Amino acid sequence: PSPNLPPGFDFTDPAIYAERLPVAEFAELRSAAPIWWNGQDPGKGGGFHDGGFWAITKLNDVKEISRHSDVFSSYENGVIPRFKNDIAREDIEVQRFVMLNMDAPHHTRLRKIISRGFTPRAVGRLHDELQERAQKIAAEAAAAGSGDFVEQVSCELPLQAIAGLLGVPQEDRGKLFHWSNEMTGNEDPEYAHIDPKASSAELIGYAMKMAEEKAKNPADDIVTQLIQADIDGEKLSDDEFGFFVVMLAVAGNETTRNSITQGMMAFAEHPDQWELYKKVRPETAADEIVRWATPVTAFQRTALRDYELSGVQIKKGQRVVMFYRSANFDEEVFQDPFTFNILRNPNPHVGFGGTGAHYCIGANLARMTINLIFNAVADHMPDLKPISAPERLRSGWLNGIKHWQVDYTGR
């Protein structure tokens, strides 16, 4: 029996996500068609013109695709499953210059070098300064009495995480943050005038300038470890470091921001959990926040050969779209998936992707950013209560909140 969905329903349809998360639709697929052909009419495939894709809705299937990188390619069509319908193919393939959209062995070499910048020591060295700024962010917001939680609480700390990871001087962080903000949301009317391409170019130019300067003055930021050759001569060229900085500016910003915003939306909806958090400050909360937020609704892969997955024949060349939003609520993996439980432990969510070659390198940095900001929110604005409904972001694969008016004082 076919799944009870509207005819022509596209799970990457930005017009859906601008209003709601299609939670019931995902649940219907999990029950009636866990791997389902998502057809797309001509010119309505968000940049891809192959007629549709396989909607992947079960956690285990998401994990199987993520593990079998040899079959399910990121490079072939990139991992973002939706752009503007009119995007030029070359503007998709230019994104192959970032680690996210590479296959082995190119990806293998790159992740090995980049790993130097995300060692636990490198991230943990940001703990104290981010905790400081986190406390300052919440106190300044709380003093304002009320405002947009997205902008006064959620936005800054992720941007400062990136800046501190790269050693960007404070005088440059403004433009870094603007470049980062200019690379997501171009399908939402509020961001119709942003130019992700131009900001990428400028960012590359800034990053390459930074690489040659950090070569003359070996600091202790990751930049020196990345452009310094190891015993086998492996390092990032100046342009390779340019693309890595582009990768960081886009990845390190809005996903964590929307985790924070939707973490708090969850807390306002689940007072018992908010109360529990304020007393125990459990760090397991960060993972339940990411599972609940699933800031990346979906990433895609392209099959390099015929492959049978859970009884369905994936054909060579076809796209499979991993709906993390569905997998993170898989009744077969989670006890009470639709209960918000900040003590959930273990929490094998795929908010950071399925385990495999492309698993989020910023996972523990994002977790630390979330734990720090929610401790600060708990310290400074514990009686926060919302004022109006969040404004959702029009995107086909990102789960975003543009705005959320909250009373920080509590009334």
Ligand code: HEM
């Ligand atoms: C809550 C915040 C975040 C979420 C939800 C998230 C989500 C994801 C997901 C789902 C993947 C898997 C990609 C795939 O398998 O195709 C991924 C990979 C990646 N993440 Fe994140 N991420 C977050 C934070 C960050 C941060 C803070 C950084 C950098 C500071 C970062 C950098 C990356 C990179 C570079 C990759 C690609 C790694 C590779 O291809 O080897 N992410 N992320």
Ligand SMILES: COC(=O)c1cccc(-c2ccncc2)c1
């Ligand atoms: C928003 O897309 C990107 O994140 C991206 C990724 C890789 C490369 C480029 C790029 C390279 C050269 N010129 C313009 C853009 C952009």
Ligand SMILES: COC(=O)c1cccc(-c2ccncc2)c1
């Ligand atoms: C080419 O990449 C992107 O345009 C992009 C845009 C938004 C978010 C992310 C992201 C965030 C966290 N982890 C991995 C990727 C990437």
